Design an enzyme around this catalytic site. Structure first.
Site, PDB file in Angstrom:
ATOM      1  N   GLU A  47      12.343  33.318 -19.174  1.00 35.67           N
ATOM      2  CA  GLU A  47      12.506  31.904 -19.499  1.00 35.67           C
ATOM      3  C   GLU A  47      11.218  31.334 -20.072  1.00 35.67           C
ATOM      4  N   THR A  62      10.209  25.358 -16.220  1.00 39.12           N
ATOM      5  CA  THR A  62      11.116  25.503 -15.082  1.00 39.12           C
ATOM      6  C   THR A  62      12.347  26.277 -15.505  1.00 39.12           C
ATOM      7  N   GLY A  87      10.789  35.068 -24.956  1.00 36.63           N
ATOM      8  CA  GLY A  87      11.346  36.398 -25.100  1.00 36.63           C
ATOM      9  C   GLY A  87      11.737  36.724 -26.526  1.00 36.63           C
ATOM     10  N   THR A  89      20.389  32.245 -24.628  1.00 36.06           N
ATOM     11  CA  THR A  89      19.298  31.401 -25.075  1.00 36.06           C
ATOM     12  C   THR A  89      19.737  29.969 -25.368  1.00 36.06           C
ATOM     13  N   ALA A 111      30.327   9.361 -30.747  1.00 42.89           N
ATOM     14  CA  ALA A 111      31.026   8.890 -29.549  1.00 42.89           C
ATOM     15  C   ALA A 111      31.728  10.025 -28.833  1.00 42.89           C
ATOM     16  N   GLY A 154      25.832  16.156 -31.583  1.00 41.83           N
ATOM     17  CA  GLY A 154      26.190  17.481 -31.127  1.00 41.83           C
ATOM     18  C   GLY A 154      25.013  18.369 -30.782  1.00 41.83           C
ATOM     19  N   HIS A 191      47.990  11.873   2.319  1.00 42.46           N
ATOM     20  CA  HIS A 191      48.118  10.450   2.010  1.00 42.46           C
ATOM     21  C   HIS A 191      47.244   9.644   2.954  1.00 42.46           C
TER      22      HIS A 191
HETATM   23  C1  LIG Z   1      45.291   2.616  12.265  1.00 50.76           C
HETATM   24  C2  LIG Z   1      46.121   3.749  11.723  1.00 50.76           C
HETATM   25  C3  LIG Z   1      45.647   4.490  10.644  1.00 50.76           C
HETATM   26  C4  LIG Z   1      46.392   5.542  10.118  1.00 50.76           C
HETATM   27  N1  LIG Z   1      45.906   6.255   9.046  1.00 50.76           N
HETATM   28  C5  LIG Z   1      46.612   7.307   8.506  1.00 50.76           C
HETATM   29  C6  LIG Z   1      46.099   8.017   7.416  1.00 50.76           C
HETATM   30  O1  LIG Z   1      45.004   7.733   6.896  1.00 50.76           O
HETATM   31  N2  LIG Z   1      46.829   9.058   6.896  1.00 50.76           N
HETATM   32  C7  LIG Z   1      48.052   9.385   7.426  1.00 50.76           C
HETATM   33  O2  LIG Z   1      48.676  10.317   6.924  1.00 50.76           O
HETATM   34  N3  LIG Z   1      48.569   8.679   8.494  1.00 50.76           N
HETATM   35  C8  LIG Z   1      47.845   7.636   9.045  1.00 50.76           C
HETATM   36  N4  LIG Z   1      48.340   6.916  10.130  1.00 50.76           N
HETATM   37  C9  LIG Z   1      49.629   7.329  10.767  1.00 50.76           C
HETATM   38  C10 LIG Z   1      50.775   6.773   9.936  1.00 50.76           C
HETATM   39  O3  LIG Z   1      50.748   5.354   9.921  1.00 50.76           O
HETATM   40  C11 LIG Z   1      52.104   7.262  10.482  1.00 50.76           C
HETATM   41  O4  LIG Z   1      52.055   8.676  10.639  1.00 50.76           O
HETATM   42  C12 LIG Z   1      53.212   6.802   9.525  1.00 50.76           C
HETATM   43  O5  LIG Z   1      53.335   5.410   9.651  1.00 50.76           O
HETATM   44  C13 LIG Z   1      54.579   7.413   9.815  1.00 50.76           C
HETATM   45  O6  LIG Z   1      55.566   6.674   9.129  1.00 50.76           O
HETATM   46  P1  LIG Z   1      57.104   6.697   9.629  1.00 50.76           P
HETATM   47  O7  LIG Z   1      58.030   6.336   8.500  1.00 50.76           O
HETATM   48  O8  LIG Z   1      57.472   8.028  10.253  1.00 50.76           O
HETATM   49  O9  LIG Z   1      57.119   5.542  10.737  1.00 50.76           O
HETATM   50  P2  LIG Z   1      56.405   4.128  10.565  1.00 50.76           P
HETATM   51  O10 LIG Z   1      55.376   4.179   9.471  1.00 50.76           O
HETATM   52  O11 LIG Z   1      55.806   3.639  11.861  1.00 50.76           O
HETATM   53  O12 LIG Z   1      57.650   3.210  10.146  1.00 50.76           O
HETATM   54  C14 LIG Z   1      58.704   3.003  11.059  1.00 50.76           C
HETATM   55  C15 LIG Z   1      59.340   1.661  10.734  1.00 50.76           C
HETATM   56  O13 LIG Z   1      60.658   1.642  11.243  1.00 50.76           O
HETATM   57  C16 LIG Z   1      60.897   0.378  11.826  1.00 50.76           C
HETATM   58  N5  LIG Z   1      61.904   0.520  12.885  1.00 50.76           N
HETATM   59  C17 LIG Z   1      61.777   1.247  14.035  1.00 50.76           C
HETATM   60  N6  LIG Z   1      62.928   1.122  14.723  1.00 50.76           N
HETATM   61  C18 LIG Z   1      63.782   0.330  14.038  1.00 50.76           C
HETATM   62  C19 LIG Z   1      65.076  -0.116  14.293  1.00 50.76           C
HETATM   63  N7  LIG Z   1      65.705   0.244  15.409  1.00 50.76           N
HETATM   64  N8  LIG Z   1      65.705  -0.935  13.378  1.00 50.76           N
HETATM   65  C20 LIG Z   1      65.054  -1.311  12.219  1.00 50.76           C
HETATM   66  N9  LIG Z   1      63.772  -0.865  11.971  1.00 50.76           N
HETATM   67  C21 LIG Z   1      63.148  -0.055  12.867  1.00 50.76           C
HETATM   68  C22 LIG Z   1      59.563  -0.078  12.379  1.00 50.76           C
HETATM   69  O14 LIG Z   1      59.493  -1.481  12.415  1.00 50.76           O
HETATM   70  C23 LIG Z   1      58.588   0.500  11.371  1.00 50.76           C
HETATM   71  O15 LIG Z   1      58.259  -0.469  10.398  1.00 50.76           O
HETATM   72  C24 LIG Z   1      47.620   5.871  10.665  1.00 50.76           C
HETATM   73  C25 LIG Z   1      48.104   5.139  11.745  1.00 50.76           C
HETATM   74  C26 LIG Z   1      47.355   4.081  12.274  1.00 50.76           C
HETATM   75  C27 LIG Z   1      47.894   3.301  13.432  1.00 50.76           C
HETATM   76  C1  LIG Z   2      22.829  15.235 -21.929  1.00 42.53           C
HETATM   77  C2  LIG Z   2      23.725  16.397 -21.594  1.00 42.53           C
HETATM   78  C3  LIG Z   2      24.704  16.271 -20.604  1.00 42.53           C
HETATM   79  C4  LIG Z   2      25.523  17.358 -20.294  1.00 42.53           C
HETATM   80  N1  LIG Z   2      26.483  17.250 -19.312  1.00 42.53           N
HETATM   81  C5  LIG Z   2      27.296  18.312 -19.002  1.00 42.53           C
HETATM   82  C6  LIG Z   2      28.249  18.187 -17.990  1.00 42.53           C
HETATM   83  O1  LIG Z   2      28.369  17.128 -17.366  1.00 42.53           O
HETATM   84  N2  LIG Z   2      29.065  19.259 -17.683  1.00 42.53           N
HETATM   85  C7  LIG Z   2      28.922  20.444 -18.382  1.00 42.53           C
HETATM   86  O2  LIG Z   2      29.651  21.391 -18.109  1.00 42.53           O
HETATM   87  N3  LIG Z   2      27.972  20.577 -19.381  1.00 42.53           N
HETATM   88  C8  LIG Z   2      27.160  19.508 -19.684  1.00 42.53           C
HETATM   89  N4  LIG Z   2      26.215  19.636 -20.668  1.00 42.53           N
HETATM   90  C9  LIG Z   2      26.275  20.851 -21.541  1.00 42.53           C
HETATM   91  C10 LIG Z   2      25.515  21.951 -20.828  1.00 42.53           C
HETATM   92  O3  LIG Z   2      24.223  21.465 -20.573  1.00 42.53           O
HETATM   93  C11 LIG Z   2      25.442  23.257 -21.615  1.00 42.53           C
HETATM   94  O4  LIG Z   2      26.757  23.683 -21.838  1.00 42.53           O
HETATM   95  C12 LIG Z   2      24.743  24.335 -20.786  1.00 42.53           C
HETATM   96  O5  LIG Z   2      23.379  24.004 -20.593  1.00 42.53           O
HETATM   97  C13 LIG Z   2      24.866  25.718 -21.431  1.00 42.53           C
HETATM   98  O6  LIG Z   2      24.049  26.628 -20.744  1.00 42.53           O
HETATM   99  P1  LIG Z   2      23.407  27.975 -21.362  1.00 42.53           P
HETATM  100  O7  LIG Z   2      22.936  28.781 -20.170  1.00 42.53           O
HETATM  101  O8  LIG Z   2      24.370  28.740 -22.221  1.00 42.53           O
HETATM  102  O9  LIG Z   2      22.179  27.499 -22.269  1.00 42.53           O
HETATM  103  P2  LIG Z   2      21.005  26.491 -21.843  1.00 42.53           P
HETATM  104  O10 LIG Z   2      21.354  25.605 -20.680  1.00 42.53           O
HETATM  105  O11 LIG Z   2      20.634  25.667 -23.061  1.00 42.53           O
HETATM  106  O12 LIG Z   2      19.781  27.440 -21.464  1.00 42.53           O
HETATM  107  C14 LIG Z   2      19.086  28.126 -22.470  1.00 42.53           C
HETATM  108  C15 LIG Z   2      17.759  28.484 -21.840  1.00 42.53           C
HETATM  109  O13 LIG Z   2      17.205  29.595 -22.503  1.00 42.53           O
HETATM  110  C16 LIG Z   2      15.851  29.349 -22.776  1.00 42.53           C
HETATM  111  N5  LIG Z   2      15.534  30.141 -23.956  1.00 42.53           N
HETATM  112  C17 LIG Z   2      16.109  30.050 -25.195  1.00 42.53           C
HETATM  113  N6  LIG Z   2      15.533  30.978 -25.981  1.00 42.53           N
HETATM  114  C18 LIG Z   2      14.618  31.662 -25.252  1.00 42.53           C
HETATM  115  C19 LIG Z   2      13.751  32.712 -25.550  1.00 42.53           C
HETATM  116  N7  LIG Z   2      13.735  33.243 -26.762  1.00 42.53           N
HETATM  117  N8  LIG Z   2      12.919  33.214 -24.577  1.00 42.53           N
HETATM  118  C20 LIG Z   2      12.939  32.668 -23.313  1.00 42.53           C
HETATM  119  N9  LIG Z   2      13.800  31.627 -23.020  1.00 42.53           N
HETATM  120  C21 LIG Z   2      14.622  31.145 -23.973  1.00 42.53           C
HETATM  121  C22 LIG Z   2      15.764  27.855 -22.998  1.00 42.53           C
HETATM  122  O14 LIG Z   2      14.451  27.406 -22.768  1.00 42.53           O
HETATM  123  C23 LIG Z   2      16.755  27.358 -21.962  1.00 42.53           C
HETATM  124  O15 LIG Z   2      16.153  27.252 -20.698  1.00 42.53           O
HETATM  125  C24 LIG Z   2      25.391  18.564 -20.969  1.00 42.53           C
HETATM  126  C25 LIG Z   2      24.425  18.680 -21.950  1.00 42.53           C
HETATM  127  C26 LIG Z   2      23.591  17.615 -22.266  1.00 42.53           C
HETATM  128  C27 LIG Z   2      22.565  17.813 -23.341  1.00 42.53           C
END
Ligand SMILES: Cc1cc2nc3c(=O)[nH]c(=O)nc-3n(C[C@H](O)[C@H](O)[C@H](O)COP(=O)(O)OP(=O)(O)OC[C@H]3O[C@@H](n4cnc5c(N)ncnc54)[C@H](O)[C@@H]3O)c2cc1C
Ligand SMILES: Cc1cc2nc3c(=O)[nH]c(=O)nc-3n(C[C@H](O)[C@H](O)[C@H](O)COP(=O)(O)OP(=O)(O)OC[C@H]3O[C@@H](n4cnc5c(N)ncnc54)[C@H](O)[C@@H]3O)c2cc1C
EC number: 1.8.1.4
Lengths: 51, 472, 468
Positions: B34, B38, B117, B146, B184, B277, B450
């Protein structure tokens, strides 16, 4: 023997045994397109030379 | 002090350093060369890492400075920007990650040679340090990684002061009052959005008719562009830049005109970012003397094993064909080195994802609607808007959608396009689906947690498959 | 005077989704809801308002603390306006419940507002709040009555100082000291929220690990450690003898392994769990037998003893999660329509929405031991992940458990940033019976958190990661 629920349903829906379909996907996975290919070769078959 | 080796890797960018680490792990005696101070290449030093850091920090600054936090009942007296400090947080991340590579090299017994190189023979590489200090390496295999460099803009000369490439844009000492971006694409949009957030008045000028570079889905691009404009990001598309001149006040006159012709005007800025580019870097590497010729775009030609015209000399990453992305370069370095161990070597670029780390984020993998129409593939479309996604709504972060493209009759997923919150991470679920040849229905039947952003991915697939989703 | 093909009782994640699906497949569909708003537990007093407050409190913590300062975002004063924060929470809930109504409309689902009882094998009766009933004659009944707060034997919830979830979600002021009973998923989330806003928080838990059932112990342990560094305090392997409301307003809490002790709090949260709600439904009046906890037994099509009356959601066996409920609703109605019905709960993911997040799907290590399966272990720390590291957000790890013989993925466990979203990729991999090696060879975007998942699988498969 590899095939997703959807592929297994399609096969079963058209009465196709999975054993008579070779897959074309990864590691011989059976894709929908394979079921569809088979279903299609199965109709052209009635027009292939035999006796 | 010559050195013998099984695999010599030239370059320590994402492609080189990963291929080096891997070659060592497989038992190869491995040297990595290289030229820069770095390791880590373009991505870590002046690419992915610093831009993503500034994208994060500037986003939080926007939330604080704006209405977002206040609607949440986080009332802050007077929000001010400390640009130096913000740049410090960015450098810290770069330092830690670049240093981390040296550590991994040491841990895997990768031999690190610091110098420029040059391939001095079919089985030899020579590194020349600054002080002229030389170092020879005799090797079975050579891996060329390179990389790439900034593509210059004819007429305008980059000085990394007021006329900057991506490198200068990442280290501006103050928020420009006014900034013009030439290009762009993914990178221009990100860097443009960063400074716009920090208070810059920003305009990107693009010769083509859409933002986001090649392969982006037209509808996704258009919705993206629209949202960016609402944020204050300005665009002039189908526009050509003819030149730029430094005025006497320091400001900069950029002259433009329709790509078709005429409508000639002049926009003025404090900072001009040239971002049209990047191109392959092969300077003084010794390809000429080797009879390895380039393609008309500067890329080293290679076969499906990444071998060049010379069977023991390999090339990967930005310096060869394909998406110029870091994860693409890493993958290539891995499979190439596996190939040298007698492995199989297979990559399909249609399975490589793209991400824009703006806000909203944009990510996609596979084929766009346009790419499908021009290949004469028959397809259906499922869409789900983040407006009807629970976690998005609960966070009041509801811009955008997921769009799934399926084959019309095989239900095979062909492309997935995300505009909105968490797109970058979400596209990796889609990547995995492609690897397995997933069908829209398949993804629809998989239980998703979910409430999560990923349900929008699930719903979109449900709509593509069944014609209807549940929550929209 | 009204009748249908399918009548779902309850508008929870379980019922409303089952309702909409029922309709879409060509069924004359009715959905009955005792409560004023649709949604069930999730939308009104569950997932949605807790996630809301976790978001707002996470942001508050970043603005108020060292985080924003390190990024060059500087502020004079950071003040909490808890009314506005609560308001934002509410806006989220109103919007989401209204969306379900618009969805029933759009799908031609008939909404009936009243407490419903099953009066006949093909008849459901919904008694409004003013007596005026409404009757439904129906070929199929689907019970999705969900669940309720499980009371703590000898503790008396008054949603004031001794609140349940509902209460904790709407407090009027920040408690100086707060004690949570039960260090499970929900308990930790609500504690963290108030812990972030000011509260001195202490959770007390009978079992010997935070996280509820099924969480991998290594993960539970690192998670607890991390919460502790945030200031969240725990008393594990501890029993709550009972709660004593005192005169100065505060509340004394009786606790013990058996080594007695007492702690005082300004608010006490009773989060020991939840149970199926089946009151006055007409089950006993119909011949339907429950199990000891109180769930409605069903077969692999979700039908009870009576083959045209089904049950789903919290009111049944399985993890009491919203997405579990929604899935069940869907495959249940598909089954009424002659389709196939299967759901493996081993493939239902779990998520804790604290920061860092926690999420997992499949088997913990303990599960694999207790079943005598031979397995490998790949880990990867978020400290070596580019995206995590660039955001200076580096706590946690990804753990993959693979099978020693077939290299097949058996469990995925994630502690740290983006865990909630990330587990869904893990879920998709399980469905395909992915090997760790297959995942490692899927190109993941760089820089993303998801690369820790890719790498953890690489390590499980080959022995080594690249970046660690
Ligand atoms: C604070 C909190 C955070 C949670 N976060 C997540 C999470 O991030 N991800 C996740 O996957 N789960 C989460 N859960 C769990 C999730 O809410 C339950 O697993 C989900 O609600 C199950 O849905 P369900 O349709 O089986 O029953 P429910 O969502 O409880 O719906 C049942 C509905 O049926 C109605 N019902 C019941 N009996 C009758 C009836 N006899 N007549 C008419 N209507 C009736 C009730 O009023 C209720 O509205 C969380 C729960 C809590 C409490
Ligand atoms: C601003 C910017 C943002 C980018 N963002 C992304 C991104 O988000 N995601 C993504 O996938 N790609 C991104 N890229 C593209 C990505 O950087 C290049 O695709 C990637 O660096 C290709 O790697 P490479 O190993 O083939 O060559 P390079 O990364 O260019 O490495 C070539 C190396 O070889 C060395 N070298 C060359 N000739 C010699 C020699 N004769 N002797 C010794 N050392 C030598 C050079 O000094 C250099 O260190 C971005 C590029 C730029 C410029």
């Amino acid at each position: 023997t590899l095939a997703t629920p959807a592929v297994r349903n399609l096969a079963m829906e058209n009465n196709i045994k999975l054993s008579e379909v070779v897959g074309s996907g990864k590691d011989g996975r059976i894709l929908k397109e394979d079921i569809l290919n088979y279903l299609e070769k199965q109709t052209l078959e009635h027009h292939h030379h035999h006796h | 002090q010559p050195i013998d080796a099984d695999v010599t890797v030239i370059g320590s960018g994402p492609g080189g350093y990963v291929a080096a680490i891997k070659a060592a792990q497989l038992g190869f005696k491995t040297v990595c060369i290289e030229k820069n101070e770095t390791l880590g290449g373009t991505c870590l030093n002046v690419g992915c890492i610093p831009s993503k850091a500034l994208l994060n920090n500037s986003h939080y600054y926007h939330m604080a400075h704006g209405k977002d936090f206040a609607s949440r009942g986080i009332e802050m007296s007077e929000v001010r920007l400390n640009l130096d400090k913000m740049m410090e947080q960015k450098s810290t991340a770069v330092k830690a990650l670049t240093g981390g590579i040296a550590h991994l090299f040491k841990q895997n017994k990768v031999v690190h040679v610091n110098g420029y190189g040059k391939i001095t023979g079919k089985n030899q590489v020579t590194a020349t340090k600054a002080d002229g200090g030389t170092q020879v390496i005799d090797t079975k295999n050579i891996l060329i990684a390179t990389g790439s460099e900034v593509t210059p803009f004819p007429g305008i000369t980059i000085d990394e002061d007021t006329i900057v490439s991506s490198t200068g844009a990442l280290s501006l000492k103050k928020v420009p009052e006014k900034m013009v971006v030439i290009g762009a694409g993914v990178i221009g949009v990100e860097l443009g959005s960063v400074w716009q957030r920090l208070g810059a008045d920003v305009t990107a000028v693009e010769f083509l008719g859409h933002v986001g570079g090649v392969g982006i889905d037209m509808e996704i691009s258009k919705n993206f562009q629209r949202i960016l404009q609402k944020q204050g990001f300005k665009f002039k598309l189908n526009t050509k830049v003819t030149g730029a001149t430094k005025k006497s006040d320091g400001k900069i006159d950029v002259s433009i005109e329709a790509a078709s012709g005429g409508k000639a005007e002049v926009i003025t800025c404090d900072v001009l970012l040239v971002c049209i580019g990047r191109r392959p870097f092969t300077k003084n590497l010794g390809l000429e003397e080797l009879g390895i010729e380039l393609d008309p775009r500067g890329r080293i030609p290679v076969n499906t094993r990444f071998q060049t015209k010379i069977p023991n000399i390999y090339a990967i990453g930005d310096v060869v064909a394909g998406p110029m992305l870091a994860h693409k370069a890493e993958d290539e370095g891995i499979i190439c080195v596996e190939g040298m161990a007698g492995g199989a070597v297979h990559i399909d670029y249609n399975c490589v994802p793209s991400v824009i780390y703006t806000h909203p984020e944009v990510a996609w993998v596979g084929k766009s609607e346009e790419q499908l129409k021009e290949e004469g593939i028959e397809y259906k479309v499922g869409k789900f808007p983040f407006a009807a996604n629970s976690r998005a709504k609960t966070n009041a972060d509801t811009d955008g959608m997921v769009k799934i493209l399926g084959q019309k009759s095989t239900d095979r997923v062909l492309g997935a396009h995300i505009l909105g919150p968490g797109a970058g991470e979400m596209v990796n679920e889609a990547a995995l689906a492609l690897e397995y040849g997933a069908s829209c229905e398949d993804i629809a039947r998989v239980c998703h947690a979910h409430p999560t952003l990923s349900e929008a991915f699930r719903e979109a697939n449900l709509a593509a498959s069944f014609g209807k989703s549940i929550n929209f």
